[PDB]
């Protein structure tokens, strides 16, 4: 029991679930906030749903109404939800670079003005697109100076705390990143809270890797692994799609290519738009990526493996009837003493839009803490808890060491 | 390629957009496609030569493709990759290193193809100026177009020397250039960048 325990009462009568969407004018000098909410318990008509928006202390727009949405087919509506639809005048966007972010309150009451309860999230403008090869925010193209990172503590192993996520941000910030991936599972809560705070791009990935099977594909591409790994995508997104952090979202890792990741592929874009997906699973470009994504393809060589080569990047792109951004999900492997040639890297990203950056690997050495004979302690890695089988240094390829104290 | 070429104007589109030069052009273009359109060698048509990009080359393109659909058209002027040309053939872009001229840049080969919503192949229509102690960096070439399959190679310029056999004080030849002759103005050296002599003698 890794993560945090808790006890939450509701009323009998609640919100069992809200999203938030943002639209945006050509120019963006307005918008338009939607929430829909829906509700679990006994709908009377005395109920009411009311949805603010605040930009600090500052009340910026404020939408009420009772429970029933459109009619959406032969049958009608949904009864237990309702829609609605704030307009908002030159709103502050969101960014890495300004986290300009407001706080919606959704507050289901009764007609008489009395409060049943009370749920909110905060929200960031922001639109995120692929428009003609090219990743946008908010209009214009990024350029993601990123790492990977896991979530661990020499220390405490895999248990997060704020004091530390805190610090990796920081880290990080200051040393010149814009993003995050999160390798390769969805991260402890707060994670997302933070970033929105901070201000970094995320990634959100699904907690699905099969790496160790022969080939690869064997589960993802079986139908009976469909609804296990279905449910790993779908609670994922129901959790963290009000997240303006977040702006991509990210199959898995290294599960080959399966019809498994086409369906939960084309989920995604049906559930949520509002982002794109990658997946870089058998090959880096198949279906099931909006993005190419490889890990380790090199900047002018290609490495041209049977099935799935990894051509040089700048090839990439130009390769026939080629036309998506591309973006390492892994690159520059800074284990030890690395990150020689990192700079033709971020010189190809300068020379070529299409190369929008990438994500080093990566932030923390996963190394662990051991005691002497005298109760001194030392870097421990694969192997030396006795471990089997093991992968002994494999673990250490951060650019900085488990106590966050940086590599050169 | 149609014997069209106003380098000379400023800008280079001033006749080529003009309305009341198409006609002269498209006797040009047509009459070279009525007399050479059965030879099986001719696989690519071309409009002409720097003679920037006018609304007449459009017009032309697309009677061709009307005509004769056998074979693509090409043509440079105007950034090499206008609405007038099925394929980007630049001349003198390189390979890595990218010349924005304003208006009309020379992207580095690898990059142009890659440039969002492109798709053509790329062939240089020039490259690699062959002039007297030259074509340094030529294999950087043949390595891309080898690497990369949307850039299908080029032409290199040019053949021959075009230079002139003079004669001196005892009727022994010399080979002469711009403004031996008290040619005016004129560019000298410039007519030499041919791989052969005049006379078809190898250059290194």
Request: proline share 6%; charged share 25%; hydrophobic share 35%.
């Amino acid at each position: 029991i890794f993560r945090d325990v808790s006890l939450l009462h509701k009323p009998t009568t609640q919100i069992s679930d809200f999203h938030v969407a943002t639209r945006f004018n050509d120019d963006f000098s307005r918008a338009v906030l939607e929430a829909e909410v829906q509700m679990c318990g006994e709908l009377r008509d005395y109920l009411r749903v009311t949805v603010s928006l605040w930009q600090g202390e500052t009340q910026v727009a404020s939408g009420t109404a009772p429970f029933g949405g459109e009619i959406i087919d032969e049958r009608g509506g949904y009864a237990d939800r309702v829609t609605l639809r704030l307009n908002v005048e030159n709103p502050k966007l969101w960014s890495a670079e300004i986290p300009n972010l407001y706080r919606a309150v959704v507050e289901l009451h009764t007609a008489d003005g009395t409060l049943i309860e009370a749920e909110a999230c905060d929200v960031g403008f922001r639109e995120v697109r692929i428009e003609n090869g090219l990743l946008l925010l908010n209009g214009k193209p990024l350029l993601i100076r990123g790492v990977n990172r896991h979530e661990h503590h020499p220390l405490h192993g895999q248990v997060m705390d704020e004091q530390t996520m805190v610090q990796d941000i920081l880290l990080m910030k200051q040393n010149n990143f814009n993003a995050v991936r999160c390798s390769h599972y969805p991260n402890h809560p707060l994670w997302y809270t933070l970033c929105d705070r901070y201000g970094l791009y995320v990634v959100d990935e699904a907690n699905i890797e099969t790496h160790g099977m022969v080939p690869m594909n064997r589960l993802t591409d079986d139908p009976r692994w469909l609804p296990a790994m279905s449910e790993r995508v779908t609670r994922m997104v129901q959790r963290d799609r009000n997240h303006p952090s977040v702006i991509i979202w990210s199959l898995g890792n290294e599960s080959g290519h399966g019809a498994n990741h086409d369906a939960l592929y084309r989920w995604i874009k049906s559930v949520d738009p509002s982002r794109p997906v990658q997946y870089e699973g058998g090959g880096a470009d198949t279906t099931a990526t909006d993005i190419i994504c490889p890990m380790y393809a090199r900047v002018d060589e290609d490495q041209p493996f049977p099935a799935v080569p990894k051509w040089s990047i700048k090839k990439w792109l130009s390769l026939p009837g080629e036309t998506r951004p591309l973006i390492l999900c892994e690159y520059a492997h800074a284990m030890g003493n690395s990150l020689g040639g990192f700079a033709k890297y971020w010189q190809a990203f300068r020379q070529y839009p299409r190369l929008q950056g990438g994500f080093v690997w990566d932030w923390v050495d996963q190394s662990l803490i051991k005691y002497d004979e005298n109760g001194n302690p030392w870097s421990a890695y694969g192997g030396d808890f006795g471990d089997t089988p093991n992968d002994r240094q494999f673990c250490m390829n951060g650019l900085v060491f488990a106590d966050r104290t940086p590599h050169p």
